[PDB]
Design an enzyme around this catalytic site. Structure first.
Site, mmCIF file in Angstrom:
data_model
loop_
_atom_site.group_PDB
_atom_site.id
_atom_site.type_symbol
_atom_site.label_atom_id
_atom_site.label_comp_id
_atom_site.label_asym_id
_atom_site.label_seq_id
_atom_site.Cartn_x
_atom_site.Cartn_y
_atom_site.Cartn_z
ATOM 1 N N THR A 264 0.837 -1.219 0.000
ATOM 2 C CA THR A 264 0.000 0.000 0.000
ATOM 3 C C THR A 264 0.865 1.259 0.000
ATOM 4 O O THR A 264 0.428 2.229 -0.554
ATOM 5 C CB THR A 264 -0.975 0.025 1.178
ATOM 6 O OG1 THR A 264 -0.239 -0.180 2.371
ATOM 7 C CG2 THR A 264 -2.076 -1.002 1.048
ATOM 8 N N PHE A 389 -6.906 4.637 6.413
ATOM 9 C CA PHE A 389 -6.244 3.691 7.309
ATOM 10 C C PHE A 389 -7.233 2.916 8.184
ATOM 11 O O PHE A 389 -6.840 2.328 9.199
ATOM 12 C CB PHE A 389 -5.216 4.426 8.173
ATOM 13 C CG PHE A 389 -4.051 4.974 7.400
ATOM 14 C CD1 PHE A 389 -3.053 4.130 6.916
ATOM 15 C CD2 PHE A 389 -3.947 6.339 7.157
ATOM 16 C CE1 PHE A 389 -1.968 4.639 6.199
ATOM 17 C CE2 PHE A 389 -2.863 6.854 6.436
ATOM 18 C CZ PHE A 389 -1.870 5.996 5.967
ATOM 19 N N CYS A 396 -5.096 0.966 10.918
ATOM 20 C CA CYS A 396 -3.791 0.530 10.453
ATOM 21 C C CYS A 396 -2.764 0.785 11.548
ATOM 22 O O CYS A 396 -2.638 1.904 12.054
ATOM 23 C CB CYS A 396 -3.407 1.276 9.179
ATOM 24 S SG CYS A 396 -1.732 0.942 8.575
HETATM 25 C C1 HEM Z 1 -0.247 3.976 2.771
HETATM 26 C C2 HEM Z 1 -0.009 2.785 3.345
HETATM 27 C C3 HEM Z 1 -1.103 1.959 4.069
HETATM 28 C C4 HEM Z 1 -2.433 1.988 3.902
HETATM 29 C C5 HEM Z 1 -3.262 2.869 2.925
HETATM 30 C C6 HEM Z 1 -3.009 1.014 4.821
HETATM 31 C C7 HEM Z 1 -4.350 0.731 4.982
HETATM 32 C C8 HEM Z 1 -4.856 -0.072 5.987
HETATM 33 C C9 HEM Z 1 -6.249 -0.308 6.273
HETATM 34 C C10 HEM Z 1 -7.440 0.322 5.502
HETATM 35 C C11 HEM Z 1 -6.318 -1.147 7.314
HETATM 36 C C12 HEM Z 1 -7.615 -1.683 7.966
HETATM 37 C C13 HEM Z 1 -7.918 -3.033 7.321
HETATM 38 C C14 HEM Z 1 -9.334 -3.495 7.603
HETATM 39 O O1 HEM Z 1 -10.167 -2.702 8.143
HETATM 40 O O2 HEM Z 1 -9.629 -4.665 7.253
HETATM 41 C C15 HEM Z 1 -4.967 -1.489 7.715
HETATM 42 C C16 HEM Z 1 -4.600 -2.332 8.752
HETATM 43 C C17 HEM Z 1 -3.339 -2.832 9.000
HETATM 44 N N1 HEM Z 1 -2.158 -2.377 8.428
HETATM 45 FE FE1 HEM Z 1 -2.038 -0.908 7.025
HETATM 46 N N2 HEM Z 1 -1.983 0.428 5.521
HETATM 47 C C18 HEM Z 1 -0.799 0.970 5.089
HETATM 48 C C19 HEM Z 1 0.467 0.668 5.549
HETATM 49 C C20 HEM Z 1 0.820 -0.289 6.469
HETATM 50 C C21 HEM Z 1 2.173 -0.523 6.983
HETATM 51 C C22 HEM Z 1 3.403 0.319 6.540
HETATM 52 C C23 HEM Z 1 2.113 -1.561 7.842
HETATM 53 C C24 HEM Z 1 3.230 -2.227 8.679
HETATM 54 C C25 HEM Z 1 4.407 -1.660 8.973
HETATM 55 C C26 HEM Z 1 0.730 -1.998 7.889
HETATM 56 C C27 HEM Z 1 0.222 -3.031 8.644
HETATM 57 C C28 HEM Z 1 -1.116 -3.162 8.942
HETATM 58 C C29 HEM Z 1 -1.675 -4.116 9.873
HETATM 59 C C30 HEM Z 1 -0.864 -5.180 10.670
HETATM 60 C C31 HEM Z 1 -2.999 -3.928 9.895
HETATM 61 C C32 HEM Z 1 -4.006 -4.722 10.759
HETATM 62 C C33 HEM Z 1 -4.070 -3.997 12.101
HETATM 63 C C34 HEM Z 1 -5.040 -4.609 13.086
HETATM 64 O O3 HEM Z 1 -6.216 -4.926 12.717
HETATM 65 O O4 HEM Z 1 -4.633 -4.701 14.270
HETATM 66 N N3 HEM Z 1 -0.014 -1.204 7.037
HETATM 67 N N4 HEM Z 1 -4.095 -0.813 6.875
#
Ligand code: HEM
Length: 451
Positions: A264, A389, A396
């Site tokens: 992403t 996010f 996120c």
């Molecule tokens: C621009 C970059 C990013 C975008 C747009 C993004 C977007 C999102 C979104 C929308 C979710 C929620 C997912 C859901 O509701 O099903 C999420 C969760 C998550 N993201 Fe990101 N993300 C990004 C970068 C990252 C990065 C850099 C990492 C790790 C270093 C990461 C790790 C995670 C994890 C582990 C979750 C699950 C968190 C949980 O439910 O406890 N993401 N992200």
């Protein structure tokens, strides 16, 4: 409730039999409005597009994160890692508490040096191009973001800039996510025709899992005193249960962070640079900030925090094309959405983030225009109007990591290069559960500023 065209006994399922389902769903939302029912054989969901309705869906007392059909398929390799676990699974809240310290302000300052390490390799690659050579933007951004999570998170060097072809991990990761997206449109998944697809799928997962063994084995054998994301996975204890993560969950988290931690973000940098070269006055303003603020050969952590306008550019890129475009929710109990759509416990919702981000009642009439100035004061944005996010405790965890990396890298790019949209590129959005402007290329001319 409005519903798009149906196909007999397949209901709406054939509408998602396309290379660009999210883009197909956005046009349906333009046709049908803030909410619309989408049925498949033995499956139903409701796609939300307005802030009016999504602000209720983001009410955590009424709705919790759902695992969509897509996420259920990816859970075959992501397991009960943070991204693919249910809120009520014990391993979710344990890892949530154990790994949030890895994204503290002090943790972020500790990552900054290794982020610069990879950002400098990107800048050096482009500085070393010959005259009239061009840049493959999403390809190089993926090289950068994959290497950054590998190094910052696990002290592992993918060495993506030493390769003309993708790293084998990415080759197996993309094919394995392709297999997961094709299970949605397949009637009888345990049919002999897909005997080899499944054979490929499980060999692509063992590619990813063999790298995981190495990252773990080299940390135990290492002498260097590290304090990174893997340190917390291997050593951190949940303050609530008092327990650490177990071995199998650790493997799932590494695979999860390696994939979620780069795809992403590469999409974000790709779209940001796309909008900059399409909006030269915005680019000039961002470039002037970079030049004014990044007075040293390498950016400091404080300097990145001062790149306000670059931050605004990234948020505006996330508004038009949120790289993780749809998230799924389920009703915790019987409830009424917007005072006119009754839902029963378990009913699923899908937040169509790109449609929410184009809500004219929140953002005004010029929703297709790239204007970073709408983020001049981020507090002016109403609650639940801007959600690249996600929501609440399931938002996120890597948000600040992604934005710091992207601000650093984009700031250095604007400092060191002038950019040319030499092909007058036609935006073509590739969907692989994440979004990227496929085929986006530019030429860069160096401003000849030393590193
Ligand atoms: C621009 C970059 C990013 C975008 C747009 C993004 C977007 C999102 C979104 C929308 C979710 C929620 C997912 C859901 O509701 O099903 C999420 C969760 C998550 N993201 Fe990101 N993300 C990004 C970068 C990252 C990065 C850099 C990492 C790790 C270093 C990461 C790790 C995670 C994890 C582990 C979750 C699950 C968190 C949980 O439910 O406890 N993401 N992200």
């Amino acid at each position: 409730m409005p519903q798009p065209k149906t196909f007999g006994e397949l209901k709406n399922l054939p509408l998602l039999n396309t290379d660009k389902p999210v883009q197909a769903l956005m046009k349906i939302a333009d046709e049908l409005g803030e909410i619309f029912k989408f049925e498949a054989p033995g499956r139903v969901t409701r796609y939300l597009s307005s802030q009016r309705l999504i602000k209720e869906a983001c009410d955590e007392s009424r709705f919790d994160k759902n695992l969509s059909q897509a996420l259920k398929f990816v859970r075959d390799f992501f397991g009960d890692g943070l991204f693919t676990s249910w809120t009520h699974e014990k391993n979710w809240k344990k890892a949530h508490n154990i790994l949030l310290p890895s994204f503290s302000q002090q943790a972020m300052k500790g990552y900054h040096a290794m982020m610069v390490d990879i950002a400098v390799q990107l800048v050096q690659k482009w500085e070393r191009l010959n005259a009239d050579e061009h840049i493959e933007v999403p390809e190089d951004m993926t090289r950068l973001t994959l290497d950054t999570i590998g190094l910052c998170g696990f002290n592992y060097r993918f060495n993506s800039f030493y390769r003309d072809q993708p790293h084998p991990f990415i080759t197996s990761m993309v094919r394995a996510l392709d297999e997961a997206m094709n299970k949605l449109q397949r009637a009888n998944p345990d049919d002999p025709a897909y005997d080899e697809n499944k054979r490929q799928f499980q060999e692509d997962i063992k590619v990813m899992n063999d790298l995981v063994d190495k990252i773990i084995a080299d940390r135990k054998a290492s002498g260097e005193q590290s304090d990174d994301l893997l340190t917390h996975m291997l050593n951190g204890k949940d303050p609530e249960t008092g327990e650490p993560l177990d071995d199998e969950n650790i493997r799932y988290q590494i695979i999860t962070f390696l994939i979620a931690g780069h795809e992403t973000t590469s999409g974000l940098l790709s779209f940001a640079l796309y909008f900059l070269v399409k909006n030269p006055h915005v680019l000039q303003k961002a470039a002037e900030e970079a030049a004014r603020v990044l007075v040293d050969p390498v950016p400091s952590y404080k300097q990145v925090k001062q790149l306000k306008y670059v931050g605004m550019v990234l948020n505006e890129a996330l508004r038009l094309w949120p790289t993780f475009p749809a998230f799924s929710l389920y009703a915790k109990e019987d409830t009424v959405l917007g005072g006119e759509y009754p839902l029963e416990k378990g009913d699923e919702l899908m937040v169509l983030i790109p449609q929410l981000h184009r809500d004219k009642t929140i953002w005004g009439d010029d929703v297709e225009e790239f204007r970073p100035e709408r983020f001049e004061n981020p507090s002016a944005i109403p609650q639940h109007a801007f959600k690249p996010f996600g929501n609440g405790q399931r938002a996120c965890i890597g948000q600040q990591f992604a934005l710091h990396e992207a601000t650093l890298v984009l700031g250095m790019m604007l400092k060191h290069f002038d950019f040319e949209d030499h092909t007058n590129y036609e935006l073509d959005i590739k969907e692989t559960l994440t979004l990227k402007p496929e085929g986006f290329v530019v030429k860069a001319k160096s401003k000849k500023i030393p590193l």
